[PDB]
Structures are given as structure tokens and as C-alpha cells.
Amino acid sequence: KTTGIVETHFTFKDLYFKMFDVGAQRSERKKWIHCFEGVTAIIFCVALSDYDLVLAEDEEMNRMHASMKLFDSICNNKWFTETSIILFLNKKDLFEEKIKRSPLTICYPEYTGSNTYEEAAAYIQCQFEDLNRRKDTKEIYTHFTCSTDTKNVQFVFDAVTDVIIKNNLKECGLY
Amino acid sequence: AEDKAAVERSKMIDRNLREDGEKAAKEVKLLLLGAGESGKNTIVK
Amino acid sequence: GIALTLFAVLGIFLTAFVLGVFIKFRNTPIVKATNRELSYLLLFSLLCCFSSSLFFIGEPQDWTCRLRQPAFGISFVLCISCILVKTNRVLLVFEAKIPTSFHRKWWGLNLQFLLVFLCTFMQIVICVIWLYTAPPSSYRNQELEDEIIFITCHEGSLMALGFLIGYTCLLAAICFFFAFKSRKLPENFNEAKFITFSMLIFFIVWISFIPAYASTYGKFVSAVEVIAILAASFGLLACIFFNKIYIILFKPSRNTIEEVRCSTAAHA
Amino acid sequence: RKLPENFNEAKFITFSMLIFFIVWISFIPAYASTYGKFVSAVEVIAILAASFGLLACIFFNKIYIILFKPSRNTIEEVRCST
Amino acid sequence: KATNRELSYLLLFSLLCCFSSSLFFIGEPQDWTCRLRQPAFGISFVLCIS
Numbered sequence: 001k002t003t004g005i006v007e008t009h010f011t012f013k014d015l016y017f018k019m020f021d022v023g024a025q026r027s028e029r030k031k032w033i034h035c036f037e038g039v040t041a042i043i044f045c046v047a048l049s050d051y052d053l054v055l056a057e058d059e060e061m062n063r064m065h066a067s068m069k070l071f072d073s074i075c076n077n078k079w080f081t082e083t084s085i086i087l088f089l090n091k092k093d094l095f096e097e098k099i100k101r102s103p104l105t106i107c108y109p110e111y112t113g114s115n116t117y118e119e120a121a122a123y124i125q126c127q128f129e130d131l132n133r134r135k136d137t138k139e140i141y142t143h144f145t146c147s148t149d150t151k152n153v154q155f156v157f158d159a160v161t162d163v164i165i166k167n168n169l170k171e172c173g174l175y
Numbered sequence: 176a177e178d179k180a181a182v183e184r185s186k187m188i189d190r191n192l193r194e195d196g197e198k199a200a201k202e203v204k205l206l207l208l209g210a211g212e213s214g215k216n217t218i219v220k
Numbered sequence: 221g222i223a224l225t226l227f228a229v230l231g232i233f234l235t236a237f238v239l240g241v242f243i244k245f246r247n248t249p250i251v252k253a254t255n256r257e258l259s260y261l262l263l264f265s266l267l268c269c270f271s272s273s274l275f276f277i278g279e280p281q282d283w284t285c286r287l288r289q290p291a292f293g294i295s296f297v298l299c300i301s302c303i304l305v306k307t308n309r310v311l312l313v314f315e316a317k318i319p320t321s322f323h324r325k326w327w328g329l330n331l332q333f334l335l336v337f338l339c340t341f342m343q344i345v346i347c348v349i350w351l352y353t354a355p356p357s358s359y360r361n362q363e364l365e366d367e368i369i370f371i372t373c374h375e376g377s378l379m380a381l382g383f384l385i386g387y388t389c390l391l392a393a394i395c396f397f398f399a400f401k402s403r404k405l406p407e408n409f410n411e412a413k414f415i416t417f418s419m420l421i422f423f424i425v426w427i428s429f430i431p432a433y434a435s436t437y438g439k440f441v442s443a444v445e446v447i448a449i450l451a452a453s454f455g456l457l458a459c460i461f462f463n464k465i466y467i468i469l470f471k472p473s474r475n476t477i478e479e480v481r482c483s484t485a486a487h488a
Numbered sequence: 489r490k491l492p493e494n495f496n497e498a499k500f501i502t503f504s505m506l507i508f509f510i511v512w513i514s515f516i517p518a519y520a521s522t523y524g525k526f527v528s529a530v531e532v533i534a535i536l537a538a539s540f541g542l543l544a545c546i547f548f549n550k551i552y553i554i555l556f557k558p559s560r561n562t563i564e565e566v567r568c569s570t
Numbered sequence: 571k572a573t574n575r576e577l578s579y580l581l582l583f584s585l586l587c588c589f590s591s592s593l594f595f596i597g598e599p600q601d602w603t604c605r606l607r608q609p610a611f612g613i614s615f616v617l618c619i620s
């Protein structure tokens with residue numbers, strides 16, 4: 001019925017999680033971007049299959065470049081200096097299917113090498129993880145989605161636990 | 176009289192405010208970003 | 221006595237050197253993983269413990285027989301309490317996986333010093349009570365050997381001496397249980413293979429010197445006491461510090477944030 | 489010491505030998521100081537301490553895994569081989 | 571059976587001998603006792619360490 005922020009709630013191993021989806025706002029990001037300060041982690045999603053898809057429909061903008069630009073803008077905000085990012089590279093089946101039909105070299109002028117999933121994934125990831133510059137305070141966790149099993153929830157739970165532990169140690173001053 | 180009623184109402188409001196805040200403090204908040212058609216739907220499901 | 225004096229001076233020098241390294245590299249992640257303030261307090265207490273062995277050499281005047289034991293007792297209790305508080309706080313931080321907690325004030329920096337003071341108050345109150353009521357004094361014994369005169373101090377209380385030893389031994393024993401609980405902590409925060417060895421060094425030197433104290437009398441008793449004190453202090457210092465000092469000065473590549481991030485992550 | 493084969497046996501043997509060395513260096517000063525009936529005692533304490541050390545370090549852990557503790561947990565050959 | 575089943579028995583017997591050797595020291599010294607104190611301990615301990 002209502003538009004705007006959508007909230008989903010679930011409990012995993014006695015931890016209560018809250019997730020806010022802000023994709024329906026369609027307004028200036030800066031005005032509402034200072035309201036979300038204080039979150040524990042930021043979940044970020046990227047599709048590998050957009051390398052050879054002109055999703056944007058603009059010749060100048062390729063979906064991968066747009067995703068990289070958005071990730072760069074989000075990661076280096078003044079407010080989110082100390083919030084970690086859980087990066088989810090998604091759709092690894094179709095991407096692996098199309099690599100041999102059209103290699104990864106279309107997106108980047110530099111060669112990925114070998115035209116196969118392991119090498120291609122490494123090049124796309126390294127290129128996404130190098131966008132950050134506050135390496136001292138924030139870190140990125142990367143998981144390739146697995147549909148059948150529950151690796152998706154467990155990875156988020158473990159990442160949140162690690163973030164909480166590292167936050168407490170830093171406050172004590174030990175870390 | 177009126178001061179007593181106001182004080183009692185304030186103390187009832189304050190007690191409810193404290194406990195609810197303590198309960199909220201025990202939750203983890205996550206922000207889900209992503210351009211549309213990036214598979215956000217699959218993670219949510 | 222010259223050898224004992226030289227060894228005490230060397231111990232003081234090495235104690236000062238470790239403190240100088242910690243101050244030069246305070247920012248480094250390895251040094252910051254260990255509690256820096258408690259480290260300084262432990263080093264100062266260790267300097268006091270090493271310097272307290274100089275009261276056992278020379279003519280035993282009355283003003284020395286009262287300060288021979290309590291100085292060492294308080295100095296060693298300070299180190300034990302510092303070690304205990306340093307280990308319990310790391311355990312409290314790691315166990316708190318929960319987002320929120322009531323133990324926020326429990327791990328506060330100021331509370332640590334109060335706990336170290338509470339663990340030495342008992343040793344301070346037995347000493348003051350002992351000195352006020354039945355103080356030690358010097359006496360000359362001509363009975364042992366008809367031809368030679370010896371100068372020694374008589375404590376005047378043997379129950380008071382027993383209580384200090386019992387309290388120190390009790391604290392050393394708890395240092396075993398807290399060392400045992402900490403074996404599963406990650407690297408750069410786990411120290412369980414040194415505390416137990418230091419406590420065992422102390423127990424073996426003192427337990428070994430029981431026969432001599434019960435049988436021998438004369439100048440030898442003081443030499444045995446000095447040797448035991450010096451050996452215990454050296455063992456504690458070495459086990460606690462010389463590993464980290466080596467990693468910091470030699471192999472400096474380890475003192476990097478990436479290493480400590482990789483270390484803490486192994487827990488999850 | 490790094491090798492994890494057989495319940496960390498190398499680590500245990502190394503820890504046991506250090507106790508022996510510590511016990512015996514501490515013996516020399518005690519012996520010279522004692523004269524009379526207690527000269528004999530300084531030998532029994534050393535022997536007992538060393539014997540209690542070696543046996544406990546080498547066997548305590550395996551005995552727990554075998555009896556008076558979980559059985560069929562790490563008892564399997566799989567656990568001994570690794 | 572992963573460990574050697576015979577060296578373990580030999581080591582336990584040697585440790586028993588080492589434990590029992592200390593009993594000879596306690597007691598009024600006699601000619602045969604002092605001749606048998608040291609060698610028993612030495613042999614038993616060497617048997618254990620070996």
C-alpha cells in the first residue's frame with residue numbers, strides 16, 4: 001500500500017535484525033542520507049551479469065560502471081566513516097554461462113585474463129574493493145550468492161558478529 | 176494537587192519511555208542498498 | 221654481595237629498557253593490544269620489586285628489619301593483580317557478542333585502577349597492623365656458635381608472616397584459573413602459556429628453599445632470600461615481556477593493522 | 489612444536505622438559521645451604537616434582553578423551569591420524 | 571593403538587619405579603640403603619626419558 005522505506009524483520013540465532021529498503025524514495029540522496037547514521041552495517045548488492053548488458057540503455061553508461069560509481073559515492077560519505085559494507089556479488093550462473101560467448105574484456109579496457117569464472121570474479125571484485133580509501137576504519141566482506149543453502153543468512157550473521165566484536169574492542173581502546 | 180497529578184503522569188510516561196528504549200537498544204539495524212534488478216529481491220526472499 | 225648488587229642493577233636496567241620500548245611504540249597495534257596503562261603500572265611495580273632486594277644486604281639495623289618483607293610482598297601483589305585485571309577485561313570484551321550490555325561501565329578504564337587498588341588493600345592492612353603491634357627488631361645471637369656473634373632480625377609475629385605468604389599464594393593460584401579460561405582467545409589477545417609458567421617458576425623456587433629456611437642459620441638465609449626474590453622477578457619479567465619486545469624490535473612487519481584484523485577475524 | 493599430530497604431543501613433551509630443567513637448576517643452591525637431617529629431603533622433593541611433571545604433561549589429556557569424558561568424540565582413527 | 575602399546579607400558583612401569591625409589595631416602599641411613607639410593611633413581615629416570 002504505502003511507498004517509501006520498507007521494513008523486514010527476522011530472528012537468526014537469538015539476534016533481532018532490521019532491514020530498511022530505501023530504493024523507493026526517488027529524491028535527493030543527501031537530504032535523507034544523514035538520517036541513517038548509526039547503522040551497524042550496510043548491505044550492498046551487485047550483479048555480475050551486467051558486464052555484457054547495457055542495462056542503463058545509454059551508450060556512455062554501462063551498468064557495471066554505474067554500480068562502481070554508486071559504490072564509490074556511498075563508501076566515502078562523511079557520515080558513514082566507520083560502517084562496514086557487506087558486498088554481495090550476485091547472479092554467478094548466467095555470468096559464467098556468457099563469459100565464453102562474450103569475454104569480460106568488454107567492460108574494462110584492461111584484460112581480465114582466461115575468460116573463466118574464477119579469474120573474472122577475481123578481477124571484478126578486486127576492482128570493486130579498491131574503490132574504498134578509509135581502509136583503517138572500515139572493511140568489506142564479499143560472498144558469492146548460493147541459492148539452495150542458507151549461506152546467505154549465516155554470512156550476514158557472522159559479519160555482524162565480527163563488526164560488533166571489533167567495535168567493542170576499539171571502544172575499550174585495545175584495538 | 177494539580178502538581179501531584181502532573182508528577183504522577185510524568186513518572187508514568189518516563190517509566191514507559193525507559194523500558195521501550197532499553198528493548199530497542201537490543202536490535203541490529205542494516206541498510207539495504209542496490210540499483211534495481213541487482214537481485215535485492217533474492218536476498219530479501 | 222657484589223654479585224647480587226650487580227644482578228639487581230642489571231635487572232633494573234632491563235626493566236627500564238622494556239618501558240622505554242613500550243613508550244616509543246605506543247601507537248603500534250601490537251603494543252596497543254596489550255593494556256598499555258596496566259603495562260606501565262606492572263613495569264613500575266617490577267622496578268620496585270627488583271629494588272626491594274637491596275634491604276637484605278648490609279648490617280641489619282632496626283629501620284631495615286621492618287621494611288625487608290612488606291616491600292616485596294606489596295610489590296609482587298601489585299604485579300599479580302595487574303596481570304589478573306588485564307586478562308579478565310579482554311575476556312569480558314570478547315564474550316560480549318551481544319550488541320548491547322550492562323557491562324559498559326564494567327570495562328571502563330578508570331574502574332581497572334580501582335580493582336588493582338582493592339586487590340592490594342588487604343596486603344597493606346595486614347602489614348600496617350603487624351608493624352603497629354609487634355614490629356621486627358634486630359638482635360645479636362651468641363648462642364649458635366660460642367666463638368662467633370651473628371646479627372639477625374626477629375619478626376616478633378609468625379602468624380602475620382604466614383598470612384602474607386598465604387594471600388600471595390592464593391592470588392598466584394587464581395592466576396591459574398584465569399590463564400586456563402583464556403586459552404581460546406585469538407592471537408594478539410591470548411596469553412596463557414606465560415602466566416602459568418611464571419607462577420610455576422615462583423612456586424618451585426620457594427618450595428625448594430623450604431629445607432634451608434628450616435635448618436640453616438647465619439648469613440646464608442639472607443642470600444637464599446635474595447636469590448629467590450631475584451629469580452622470581454626475572455622469570456616474571458622475561459615470560460611476560462621479552463617475546464613482545466622481540467616481535468616489536470625484530471621482525472617489525474608484524475606490527476601492522478592488517479595482521480591484527482586477520483588475527484581477530486580467526487575467531488569468527 | 490608446530491606439528492598438530494596426535495593431540496599436540498610435541499608441545500606437551502616440550503613443556504614437560506622445561507619443568508625438569510627449572511626444577512634441577514633450583515636444586516643446586518638449596519643443597520649447599522642445607523646441612524644436617526634435611527640434606528636428604530632436598531633430594532626427594534626434586535624427584536617427586538620431576539616425576540609428577542612428566543607423567544601429567546604426557547598423559548592427562550589422552551586419558552580424559554578416552555574415559556570420564558566424551559567417548560566417540562575424537563576417539564575415531566580420523567582424529568588420531570590428523 | 572595409534573601410540574605404541576609397549577613403550578607406553580614400559581614408560582608407566584619406569585615411572586612407577588621412579589616414584590617408589592624415593593621411599594628409600596626417608597628412613598635411618600644404613601650401609602645397604604645409601605649404596606642403593608642414587609643408582610635406582612638414575613636408572614629409572616634414564617629409562618623414562620629414553
Ligand SMILES: CCCCCCCC/C=C\CCCCCCCC(=O)OC[C@@H](COP(=O)(O)OCC[N+](C)(C)C)OC(=O)CCCCCCC/C=C/CCCCCCCC
Nearest residue numbers: 396400403404412413416423424427428503537540541544
Ligand atoms: C620443586 C618442588 C615444586 C613442586 C610443584 C611442581 C609440580 C609439577 C608442576 C606441574 C604439573 C602440570 C604442568 C602444567 C603445564 C601446563 C601446560 C601449558 O603450559 O599449556 C599452555 C595452555 C594451553 O596451551 P596454548 O594456550 O598455548 O594453546 C591452546 C590454544 N587452543 C586452545 C586454541 C588450542 O594450558 C593451560 O591452559 C594452563 C592451565 C594451568 C595448568 C595447571 C598447573 C597447576 C600446577 C600447580 C603446582 C602447585 C604446586 C603444589 C604445592 C604443594 C606442595 C606440597
Ligand SMILES: CCCCCCCC/C=C\CCCCCCCC(=O)O[C@H](COC(=O)CCCCCCC/C=C/CCCCCCCC)COP(=O)(O)OCC[N+](C)(C)C
Nearest residue numbers: 425440447451509512513514516517519520521522523527
Ligand atoms: C631459577 C633458579 C635460580 C638459582 C640460580 C642458579 C645458579 C646458581 C649458581 C651457583 C650457586 C652458588 C655456588 C655454591 C658454592 C658454595 C657452596 C658452599 O658454600 O658449601 C660449603 C662447602 O661446599 C660444599 O659443601 C659442596 C659444594 C656443593 C656442590 C653441589 C652438589 C650437587 C650438584 C649439582 C651439580 C650437577 C650440575 C648439572 C646441571 C643441572 C641443571 C639442569 C659449606 O656450606 P654449608 O656448610 O652451609 O652446607 C653444606 C651442606 N652440604 C655438605 C650438604 C653441601
Ligand SMILES: CC(C)CCC[C@@H](C)[C@H]1CC[C@H]2[C@@H]3CC=C4C[C@@H](O)CC[C@]4(C)[C@H]3CC[C@]12C
Nearest residue numbers: 400403496500503544545546547548549550552
Ligand atoms: C591438577 C593439576 C595440579 C595437575 C594436572 C595438570 C592438568 C590439570 C593440566 C596440565 C596440562 C594442562 C593441559 C594443557 C593443554 C591443554 C590443551 C588445550 O587445548 C585444552 C586444555 C589442556 C588439555 C590442558 C588441560 C589441563 C592440563 C592437563
Ligand SMILES: N[C@@H](Cc1c[nH]c2ccccc12)C(=O)O
Nearest residue numbers: 289290292293384385388433445
Ligand atoms: N621469609 C619469607 C620470604 C618472603 C618475603 N615476602 C614474601 C612474599 C611471598 C612469599 C615469600 C616471601 C619466607 O618465609 O619465604
